[PDB]
Amino acid sequence: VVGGTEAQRNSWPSQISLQYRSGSSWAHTCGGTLIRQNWVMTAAHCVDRELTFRVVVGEHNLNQNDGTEQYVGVQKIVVHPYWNTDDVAAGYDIALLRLAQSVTLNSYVQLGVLPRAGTILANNSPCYITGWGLTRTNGQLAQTLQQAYLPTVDYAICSSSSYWGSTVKNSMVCAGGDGVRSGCQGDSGGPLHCLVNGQYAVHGVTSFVSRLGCNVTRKPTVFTRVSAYISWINNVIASN
């Protein structure tokens, strides 16, 4: 997250860290949203690589013991069948991870609230992206979970020529684009939390930013629209 602030430890309890084994250690690669005690929602592009993945819930600082982490292996990975790694702009950047164990809920570990199917946010709706992603274009991951206020950019504006053009689809949510704050690498897969009727819900799964840079004016961070996949998510969980 570029231009973020440190999140309070219990603000976003559904945020998880998706990590891969590297040598004798683990490295954060993407975020995700805990949606069932044994299921995580993340971006399909985060699991394109054939790596060993683990999920960390109750994580706050990637480089320090928080005393609240629970570490769990990823037992099954279900990527959306239309996902195409060669074409992120086509959409379908979503995957569900079945965890090896069911995690325990507490103030640091909670299920993410999802929007009802088909819900679309009005332009400029208040949202926070959260993640341990790069804090600068071509920077380094954050140590502590960051949050940045990123108001949505509706489809009509987002898909206009000075924004993302045809690359943005109605199955996505755009947010931000002010040139200062944004998602960045490492935030992928994590949530876009938006306040609707008093409650935050996870309306987006971080998918991509411009190749030019993370915080690029009129290139808002683009997320998979969670409300486009409610049936898909329920169908996956019911059959696994």
Binding residues for Ca(2+): 59, 61, 64, 69
Binding of residue 108 to Cl ion (CB under 5 A): no
Binding of residue 159 to Cl ion (CB under 5 A): no
As a 3-state breakdown, the chain gives helix, strand, coil percent values, each rounded to 5, of 10, 40, 50
Shortest CB 199 distance to Cl ion, Å = 10
Stretch that binds Cl ion, among 5-13, 36-44, 92-100, 178-186 (CB under 5 A): 5-13
Q: In what order do the strands lie in the sheet with 152-153?
A: 5-6, 146-149, 127-131, 191-196, 199-208, 221-225, 172-175, 152-153
**In sequence order, what E strands does the chain have?**
5-6, 15-22, 25-36, 39-42, 53-57, 70-79, 95-99, 127-131, 146-149, 152-153, 172-175, 191-196, 199-208, 221-225
Of 2, 4, 12, 224, the residue at the interface with Cl ion (CB under 5 A) is: 12
Residue 188 designated active-site: yes
Of 14, 29, 135, 207, the residue at the interface with Cl ion (CB under 5 A) is: 14
Shortest CB 137 distance to Cl ion, Å = 27
User: How far is residue 97's CA from residue 64's CA, in Å, rounded to a whole number?
Assistant: 25
Nearer to Cl ion, 162 or 199 (CB): 199
CA-to-CA separations, 12 to 77, 144, 177, 199, 206, in angstroms, rounded: 23, 13, 23, 12, 15
Tell me which of 45, 80, 193, 203 is the catalytic residue: 45
Residue 193 designated active-site: no
Nearer to Cl ion, 14 or 146 (CB): 14
Residue 93 designated active-site: yes
Nearer to Cl ion, 12 or 20 (CB): 12
Shortest CB 22 distance to Cl ion, Å = 27
What are the catalytic residues?
45, 93, 188
The site for Cl ion (CB under 5 A) is made up of: 12-14
